[PDB]
Structures are given as structure tokens and as C-alpha cells.
Design a protein around this ligand. Structure first.
Ligand SMILES: COC[C@@H]1C[C@H]1C#CC#Cc1ccc(C(=O)NC[C@H]2C[C@@H](NC(=O)[C@@H]3C[C@H](F)CN3)CN2C(=O)C2CC2)cc1
Ligand SMILES: [Zn+2]
Length: 290
């Protein structure tokens, strides 16, 4: 049967919040069967834990933020994307501040840390959400869609009227490596937006160390891009993080058109609300499973 996984060993890491600019200490701990992913603000007394679930997403439009009361955790999408990538069902994520460390702007450091400390299978069936019906959301010229698909796949398209722009990509994660083809894909910002956001006391941790910085014409980062299609691969990475807020791995296919975390969140909520469109499934034989 396909079994729930947690971590074998705890993992510690240090970084800076993209927005807060704060030094943050991160601890990933193993967790019992059916825990899910739980974020923990250890700096607070008493400690505040927010389950990494769609119901707990705050109305923050810079990044994916979890809330409970007036306590927040900012920029969860890259870490969740890394746990999604490696099929982690159960883990505590301890933080010493309000924001996940940005590290290098991608999921690579997080995927390295997780596999460094190993995975532990647990004596419980892994539960999957299987897409049964197409579910679509739009707003203006943006669109986000679930389609039934025997497997897991993400297609994305962006359309920036900028000289620096493939703006399309499609990855079947049952045939292609999350780790090799998507995990190293970094976040990106335009020089004028960064200048603005700095003026509003935001992007305080941003640098070429943790982002592709783009002016009107070109990539400013001396060493360039990691993929010809790094920008749209980072969109895929982000979506995979957002999807993992379902609290169960997906059997189906996602399509983004100029989508972001706000419309991504609308699609998760519309899916959860339409019980005709999905079922939870387990697999007694890993050999016959998609
Ligand atoms: C020493 O270096 C000097 C350079 C000048 C210093 C700097 C810096 C910085 C920065 C920075 C980078 C990125 C950003 C930033 O918020 N980028 C958003 C980008 C990338 C992608 N969203 C994501 O990645 C999401 C959100 C967060 F980004 C992490 N998950 C979609 N997206 C867009 O559509 C923007 C609107 C055009 C915001 C800020
Ligand atoms: Zn991102």
C-alpha cells in the first residue's frame, strides 16, 4: 500500500525573510500520522501553530501567508512546494520570526535539507484528493483550472510585455523530476517594483542572492538564469506550494494562465466547496496507482 511519510531526522536552517528582511531560524521536525504540515511560531509565548491549510490563508497579496488571530507566517509557498515535491505528509515547521527564509529564491535548498535528513514511511495509508470533474476560475484575463488526469501534472503560461520574454511550460511529475526540472527555479522582481516596495518598507531581504532582478531589458544577476524558462518554472513551483494547502496530494492536472496566489486560492476554495468534483482515495497496491 502507499504509506504516509514524515522526516527521518530534524533539520535546522537559517535565512532572511524576502519582505521582513529578518534573520529567521527554521526547524523541520518529524510528525505523527495524519498531522499534515503545521507551521509553528516558537518566538511567541505561548507558541502559535497554524496548520498549512486553505482555510488558514490570510488576505496577503505579496506572498502565501497563513494567519490565526493577529499572528501570521509569511511566504510559505516555496517550502510547501518542496514538501509537495518529495511527498511529505507530516512535519512541524518551527520559525523564530513571521516569515519563512527565502534562501536562494527557489525550493532547491529546502529539497536538499529534507533529503539530507531522509524520509520515514509510517503505518497509515496516504490519502489523495482525486479530481473527478473540471473546476475553473477566472478574473479579468487570468484563469486557473483543475482537469481530471490519472497522475500529477502542472501547465503554466505568463504574458509579460517585456523584452526578457518561453512563457509556457508543461511538466508531468510522474515522468519528470520535480527536483531537477522545477525545484531550482527562482522568484523574480522588476527593478521599478522593487524600488517601490522598498519605499513601502517591503522586499527588505531581497537581493541577487535570493532573486532574479530584471530592469526594463535584461537579467541583472551576473550569472544569468538556471533554465531558459526559469520565470514560468517558478510560477509552477509556486502553484505546487499553493496546491499543497489542500492537506492531501492531488491526482489530476492544474493549468494556470497569468494566475497568482489570489486566483490560485479561489480555485482551491471552489474545488473544496464542490464535493461532486473530487474524492479522497487510498491505494492498497502502489503498482496499479497513477
Ligand atoms: C543586492 O541585490 C540588489 C537588488 C536590488 C535588490 C533586490 C531585490 C529583490 C527582490 C524581490 C524579488 C521578487 C519579488 C516578488 O514579489 N516577485 C513576484 C513575481 C515572482 C512570482 N511570485 C513569486 O515568486 C511568489 C511571491 C514571492 F515573490 C514568492 N513567491 C510572480 N511575480 C510577478 O508576477 C511579479 C509582479 C511581476 C519582490 C522582491
Ligand atoms: Zn515564488
Amino acid at each position: 500500500m502507499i504509506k504516509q511519510r514524515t522526516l527521518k531526522n530534524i533539520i535546522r536552517a537559517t535565512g532572511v525573510g524576502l519582505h521582513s528582511g529578518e534573520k529567521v531560524y527554521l526547524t523541520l521536525k518529524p510528525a505523527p500520522v495524519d498531522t499534515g504540515i503545521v507551521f509553528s511560531r516558537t518566538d511567541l509565548d505561548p507558541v502559535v501553530e497554524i496548520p498549512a491549510r486553505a482555510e488558514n490563508v490570510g488576505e496577503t497579496t505579496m506572498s502565501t501567508t497563513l494567519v490565526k488571530g493577529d499572528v501570521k507566517v509569511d511566504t510559505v509557498e516555496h517550502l510547501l512546494s518542496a514538501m509537495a515535491g518529495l511527498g511529505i505528509d507530516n512535519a512541524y515547521v518551527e520559525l523564530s520570526a513571521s516569515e519563512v527564509p527565502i534562501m536562494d529564491g527557489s525550493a532547491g535548498p529546502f529539497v536538499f535539507l529534507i533529503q539530507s535528513a531522509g524520509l520515514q514511511e509510517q503505518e497509515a495509508a496516504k490519502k489523495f484528493i482525486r479530481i473527478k470533474r473540471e473546476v475553473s476560475v477566472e478574473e479579468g484575463d487570468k484563469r486557473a483550472v483543475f482537469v481530471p488526469f490519472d497522475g500529477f501534472k502542472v501547465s503554466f503560461e505568463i504574458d509579460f510585455d517585456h523584452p526578457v520574454f518561453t512563457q509556457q511550460a508543461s511538466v508531468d511529475f510522474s515522468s519528470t523530476s520535480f527536483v531537477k526540472e522545477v525545484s531550482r527555479a527562482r522568484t523574480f522582481g522588476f527593478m521599478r517594483d522593487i524600488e517601490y516596495l522598498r519605499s513601502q518598507n517591503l522586499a527588505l531581504g531581497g537581493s541577487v542572492e535570493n532573486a532574479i532582478v530584471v530592469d526594463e531589458n535584461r537579467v541583472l544577476n551576473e550569472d544569468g538564469l538556471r533554465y531558459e524558462d526559469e520565470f514560468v518554472k517558478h510560477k509552477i513551483l509556486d502553484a505546487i506550494g499553493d496546491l499543497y494547502l489542500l492537506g492531501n496530494s492531488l491526482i489530476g492536472e492544474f493549468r494556470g494562465f497569468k494566475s497568482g496566489h489570489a486566483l490560485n486560492n479561489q480555485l482551491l476554495r471552489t474545488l473544496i466547496a464542490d464535493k461532486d468534483a473530487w474524492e479522497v482515495v487510498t491505494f492498497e497496491d502502489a503498482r496499479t496507482a497513477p
